[PDB]
Design a protein that fits this description.
Chain D: Belongs to the bacterial ribosomal protein bL36 family. The structure is cut from a larger assembly and holds chains A (128 residues), B (136 residues), C (176 residues), D (37 residues) and E (125 residues). With 128 residues, chain A is an alpha+beta fold. In chain A, 29% of the residues lie in helices and 8% in strands. The termini of chain A are far apart. Chain E is of the alpha+beta class and 125 residues long. Chain E has 5 helices and 5 strands, in the order αβαβαβαββα. In chain E, α1 crosses α3 (54-63). Chain E is globular. The chains are: A alpha+beta (128), B alpha+beta (136), C alpha+beta (176), D mainly beta (37), E alpha+beta (125). Chains in contact: A-E. The structure holds magnesium ion (MG) (2 copies) and zinc ion. The structure holds 2 RNA strands.
Chain lengths: 128, 136, 176, 37, 125
RNA sequence: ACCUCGAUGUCGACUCAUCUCAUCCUCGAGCUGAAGCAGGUUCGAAGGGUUCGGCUGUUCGCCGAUUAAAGAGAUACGUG
RNA sequence: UACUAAGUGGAAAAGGAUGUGAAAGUGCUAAAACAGCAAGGAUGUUGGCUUAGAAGCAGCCAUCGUUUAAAGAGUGCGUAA
């Protein structure tokens, strides 16, 4: 099993999965298929390795906390947590948590909120 | 380097250090102090070494207190000379330490940190030290 | 504590006749003897397919013996019923070995020929000319012969060349 | 082998024993062997 | 404390007194994702899967007045699945969960007050 | 300033050495930022050996060529 | 009547030590204790600063929330990532 952050719009120049016995030419078309709904983003993909050289892949969301910068309206958070540079409404956090649901292993939407609350505090952002 | 600025007389007599710790007997400022178990003369150089060791292993979180201070002077006749004909010049100050005097003490930092800092300092002093916690 | 641990002496062929200082353990593979010391403080009592040893006193030496002889009895029993073995991978470039009857030889980087007498009660076998498997009755003898074989070319961290115990992870060092 | 008068563990797994009336210490890293007090 | 242990036994005993299924499973070869995945598949909030120590299980079953159920929890790692109402689906869920994974044991349990064995798990599934 | 001033002849060189190990080589071993060659440090070890010359009264030293090595000291700074 | 395993007795320091005896407390423990062994030790994170190459590990910045019996923005080892 080797995870990699293959870009969603491009898949063709490369060899570190070739030592796995992966047939690169047959899977490059598949990477550009389902990912075409979210072009221009770097999508992480899990790669299981079956003995028979069959393979099944699982795409994931764009990395957490990147979205928090957008909701805050500020390009970068504080280097010091005590310095409350930004503030975000709890309703806006609901919009963010829903996007991450496929990646998040959180049991409930209410718990999914709590998981994002520990990420908002890393940026020093107030939860209002 | 700890040193008196100026004194009255330059060549005082030696001061004994075999007693039971008149003054400085108990910890007074921190929650952990260093206590000797055998009185001896410890000079300013060792004092500075212990102070800088504690400062370096302390960090910007707490404080450290020094209790003793080299008030008494000490003479040393120069090299290659017959005795007699006056008394030698003063060379190095020294703090008299009677057995059982708190002399170093720190505070406001984790407990194992007091233990490690005081043990680090104690290996620079000639006297056989002992860790003491502040009373309740 | 191992000292008071129930030894399950299965009555397959293991018979244990106790003397003043002899313990003769015999089985399908071969008789094994244990030389007891004078005035051993342990007390050896055996029940039907059950063996248990007890200490007369609580002194430190008796406490030690209570475990050492329990372990030795268990080891002798398992050896006489099953037999131990050690596995050697003699890996290298020109490194190889084979057996000439009672005497095993080795071929290493030595300009000198190496021969090693196989003692009594031990059996050696070479599946692959670079692969050795020593088989014996007592753990002590087979281990002694294994380290005797190993002494001629110890493993080194730079290259895997040398005599290596089976299931051993040797350290690695990179020299340019 | 480090013949040092004050032996103390350096690694976490460095265990100290007393073999032949001489305290020592053994670690998987052979750079920590000590002896003699 | 003695009180804390008694409360845990009493709570478990009371739960087993209203259950429609108690099924005993070895927790061997169960990954953290598998622990969350099996619980997630058990979807409907009427069922639980928990690794429970044998001594608690034994006292709880004993005080719930269960018998011959000791063998399921005897000398083995023992997670428990306990469901409510329609209990049959829970057994199929755990049976298809192992099969999807490398392995897992399914010792047996009680279904609607009736003992079943390990072999009978397949019948129910 | 304690024995010797009604005398204990003091530097160096030559001859003969003997002893200690805090080891220079030969001997055994551990570690290494020890690939090998070559090393560095440490442990064990006193059985044996430890060069020839220029300058200086010289020990000491500098230099030259060597050897496996050109050890550190003690013996009234061994030895009229 | 105890203690000593060192010829301690029958010389000596700073310091180190699961030597060993005694006493006073204190924790767990038979609804099972410690050690060993068999399983798992997860998610948001490949967070960002930055190094062809730093993404749990070249270092640095707050360094936490969630699922769960369990869990470190990873114990250390160990990777150009
Ligand atoms: Mg005369
Ligand atoms: Mg003459
Ligand atoms: Zn170590």
């Amino acid at each position: 099993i080797a995870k990699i952050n293959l870009l969603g719009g491009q898949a063709k120049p490369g060899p570190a999965l070739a030592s796995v016995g992966i047939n690169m030419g047959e899977f490059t078309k598949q990477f550009n298929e389902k990912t075409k709904d979210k072009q221009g983003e770097m999508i992480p993909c899990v790669i299981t390795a079956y003995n028979d050289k069959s393979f099944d892949f699982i795409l994931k969301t764009t990395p957490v906390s990147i979205l928090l910068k957008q909701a805050a309206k500020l390009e970068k958070g504080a280097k010091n947590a005590k310095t409350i540079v930004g503030k975000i409404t709890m309703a806006k956090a609901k919009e963010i948590a829903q996007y991450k649901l496929v990646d998040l292993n959180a049991n409930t939407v209410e718990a999914a909120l709590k998981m994002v609350l520990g990420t908002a505090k890393q940026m020093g952002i107030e939860v209002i | 380097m700890l040193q008196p600025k100026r004194t009255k007389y330059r060549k005082p007599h030696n001061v004994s250090y075999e007693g039971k710790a008149k003054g400085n007997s108990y910890v007074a400022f921190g929650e952990y102090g260093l206590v000797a178990t055998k009185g001896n003369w410890i000079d300013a150089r060792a004092i500075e070494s212990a102070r800088i060791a504690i400062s370096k292993c302390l960090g910007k979180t707490g404080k450290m207190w020094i209790r003793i201070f080299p008030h008494m002077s000490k003479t040393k006749k120069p090299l290659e000379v017959r005795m007699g004909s006056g008394k030698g010049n003063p060379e190095f100050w020294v703090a008299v330490v009677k057995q059982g005097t708190v002399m170093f003490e720190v505070a406001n930092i984790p407990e194992s940190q007091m233990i490690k800092a005081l043990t680090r300092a104690g290996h620079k002093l000639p006297v056989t030290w002992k860790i003491l916690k502040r009373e309740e | 504590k191992i000292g008071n641990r129930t030894i399950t002496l299965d009555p397959a062929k293991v018979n244990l006749n106790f003397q003043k200082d002899h313990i003769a353990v015999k089985g399908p593979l071969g008789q094994i003897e244990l030389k007891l010391p004078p005035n051993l403080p342990l007390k050896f009592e055996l029940k039907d397919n059950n063996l248990q040893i007890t200490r007369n006193n609580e002194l430190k030496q008796s406490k030690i013996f209570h475990g050492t002889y329990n372990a030795l009895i268990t080891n002798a029993i398992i050896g006489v019923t099953q037999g131990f073995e050690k596995k050697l991978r003699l890996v290298g470039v020109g490194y190889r070995a084979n057996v000439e009857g009672e005497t095993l030889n080795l071929q290493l980087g030595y300009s000198h020929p190496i021969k090693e007498k196989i003692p009594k009660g031990l059996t050696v076998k070479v599946e692959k000319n670079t692969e050795i498997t020593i088989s014996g009755i007592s753990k002590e003898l087979v281990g002694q012969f294994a380290t005797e074989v190993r002494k001629w070319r110890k493993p080194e961290p730079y290259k895997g060349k040398g005599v290596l115990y089976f299931d051993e992870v040797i350290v690695r060092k990179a020299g340019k | 082998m480090k013949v040092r008068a004050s032996v103390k563990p350096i690694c976490k797994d460095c265990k100290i024993i007393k073999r032949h009336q001489i305290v020592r210490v053994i670690c998987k890293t052979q750079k920590h062997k000590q002896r003699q007090g | 404390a003695k009180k804390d242990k008694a409360q845990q036994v009493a709570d478990v005993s009371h739960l087993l007194s209203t259950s429609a299924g108690f099924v005993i499973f070895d927790y061997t070869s169960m990954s953290a994702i598998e622990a969350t995945s099996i619980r997630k598949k058990l979807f409907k909030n009427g069922s639980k899967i928990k690794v429970i120590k044998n001594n608690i299980l034994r006292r709880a079953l004993k005080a719930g007045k269960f018998e011959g159920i000791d063998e399921t929890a005897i000398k083995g790692k023992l997670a428990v699945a306990v469901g409510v109402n329609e209990i049959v689906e829970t057994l199929k869920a755990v049976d298809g969960v192992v099969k999807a994974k490398e392995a897992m044991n399914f010792v047996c349990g009680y279904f609607d007050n009736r003992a079943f064995n390990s072999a009978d798990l397949e019948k129910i599934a």
